[PDB]
Amino acid sequence: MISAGDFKNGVTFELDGQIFQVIEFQHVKPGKGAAFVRTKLKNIVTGATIEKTFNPTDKMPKAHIERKDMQYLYNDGDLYYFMDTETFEQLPLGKDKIGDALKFVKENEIVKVLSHKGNVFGIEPPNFVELEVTDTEPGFATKPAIVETGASIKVPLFVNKGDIIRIDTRTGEYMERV
Amino acid sequence: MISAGDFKNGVTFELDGQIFQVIEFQHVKPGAAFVRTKLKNIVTGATIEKTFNPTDKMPKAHIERKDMQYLYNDGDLYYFMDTETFEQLPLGKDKIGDALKFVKENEIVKVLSHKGNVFGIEPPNFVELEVTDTTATGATKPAIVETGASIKVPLFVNKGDIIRIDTRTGEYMERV
């Protein structure tokens, strides 16, 4: 069971004999009257996109998803390549299924590839990663930095080039050094 | 020094007063072993084929990178300045590409050269630019910054706000 008030981009649930994925949403708390969660959903089975509005307290059943560990290889433009670690078959996935999920994930890291009825719709990276800062203005309040994957991130002023930092892949945020 | 037998894609070396990047290669053993290459001339942009003895050694390339101030664009030329000597350098659009997309006048960039020929510009990784011009389920709106570049911003961002931008991705990071 999951509430509309606890939605995150990418979560999946059962509705109208259907499995949907949250593409985007606004949780609105108006000054007068009731709160509501206004959503854009992807039908996982048919691939259709719909808009729906929920009461934040509405609960729905979490979908039954298969999560397979696969080796993330590399990204070349709009496609991301993964390898099955038992059959060694490779699988390309398009940007639409990836989003920003691999921004902070190094080449060759194990990620979970999510499927419903053999139908692959997205991925789940590790919750946390540790990456080296490869460029930032030296310092001793935040500043921008580049990390080893090439991605940018805000860090405290005392994190400098050469330092290893822990990052939350869900938010894209700095946690701490080391 | 790099040995031709160790060439792989993306290696860069000096040869005949040029700098080359390896874009294709084959190592061959028949008589005499050879390496077939396709090389991109980093300065001129020409792509050539060359064959080497795997024993051949060449200097690894190092591009010269010089901080200069970007001044202004007068039609087809872009003027840059040495911040210590005040000497200026006019460059054509051919050399600039999209490098100045997020670079406002008087900002410092890196000018890339080899043995005197300038072939490119690198902007800073991050810039601060003013917003000059600016939904049911999403949380961004289109905006234009002072350089003319388009960028998606949060709904609270207004004309006149200064925003931090990743120049590689063209993405908004935060206000200020």
| Among A24, A135, A154, beta carbon nearest to B138 | A24
Give the number of A-B residue pairs with CB atoms closer than 8 Å: 33
CA distances from A23 to A26, A32, A51, A95, A99 (A): 11, 27, 10, 13, 10
CA-to-CA distance for A109 and A74, rounded, in angstroms?
Answer: 10
The answer to whether the CB atoms of A152 and B164 lie below 8 A apart is no
DSSP state of A63: P
DSSP string, B47-102: EEEEEE-TT-EEPBP--EEEEEEEEEEETTEEEEE-TTT--EEEEEHHHHTTTTTT
Q: In what order do the strands lie in the sheet with B34-41?
A: B12-15, B18-28, B34-41, B47-52
Instruction: Name, in order, each residue with C-beta under 8 angstroms of A71's C-beta and a sequence gap of 6 or more.
Output: A82, A83, A85, A108, A109, A110, A111
Question: Residue A176: which H helix or E strand, with range?
Answer: strand A173-177
Which tokens is B87 given? Answer: 């000497």
Resolution as reported, in Å: 2.0
DSSP string, B87-138: -EEEEEHHHHTTTTTT--TT-EEEEEEETTEEEEEE--SEEEEEEEE---S-
The class level of CATH for A128-178 reads mainly beta
How determined? X-ray
8 Å CB contact between A154 and A166? no
CA-to-CA distance for B147 and B169, rounded, in angstroms?
Answer: 16
Interface check for A177 against chain B (CB to CB < 8 A): the answer is: no
Fold classification of B126-176 (topology level) = OB fold (Dihydrolipoamide Acetyltransferase, E2P) (2.40.50)
Interface residue of B108, B122, B126, B166 to substitute, partner A, most A CBs within 10 Å = B126
Rounded to a whole number of angstroms, the distance from the CA of B110 to the nearest CA of chain A is: 15
Which tokens is A71 given? Answer: 């080796």
> For residue B60, how many other CB atoms are within 10 A of its CB?
11
Dihedral pair phi/psi, residue A51, rounded to 5°: -105, 135
> For residue A5, how many other CB atoms are within 10 A of its CB?
15
Q: In what order do the strands lie in the sheet with B117-122?
A: B88-92, B77-81, B64-74, B108-114, B117-122
**Which CATH number among 2.40.50.140, 2.40.160.20, 2.30.30.30, 3.40.50.300 corresponds to the domain B2-61?**
2.30.30.30
Query: Which residue of B lies nearest to A24 if distances are taken between CA atoms?
Result: B137
Angle among Cα B51, B53, B54 to the nearest 5 degrees reads: 110
> How would you class A19 by CB atoms within 10 Å of its CB: exposed for 0-12, middle for 13-18, buried for 19 or more?
buried
* Segments in A16-86 forming alpha helices (H): none
| Among B136, B164, B168, beta carbon nearest to A38 | B136
Fold classification of A64-127 (topology level) = OB fold (Dihydrolipoamide Acetyltransferase, E2P) (2.40.50)
Q: Output the CA torsion A44→A45→A49→A51 (10° steps).
A: -80
Interface check for A78 against chain B (CB to CB < 8 A): the answer is: no
A40: which chain B residues are within 8 Å (Cβ-Cβ)? 136-138
Which tokens is B29 given? Answer: 């053993």
> How would you class B46 by CB atoms within 10 Å of its CB: exposed for 0-12, middle for 13-18, buried for 19 or more?
exposed
CA-to-CA distance for B43 and B58, rounded, in angstroms?
Answer: 18
8 Å CB contact between B60 and B73? no
Breaks (C-N over 2.5 A) in chain A follow: 140
Angle among Cα B39, B42, B45 to the nearest 5 degrees reads: 80
Interface check for A53 against chain B (CB to CB < 8 A): the answer is: no
CA-to-CA distance for A169 and A149, rounded, in angstroms?
Answer: 13
3-class secondary-structure state, position A79: strand
The class level of CATH for A2-63 reads mainly beta
Question: Residue A97: which H helix or E strand, with range?
Answer: helix A95-98
DSSP state of A88: -
* Superfamily name and number for B62-125: Nucleic acid-binding proteins (2.40.50.140)
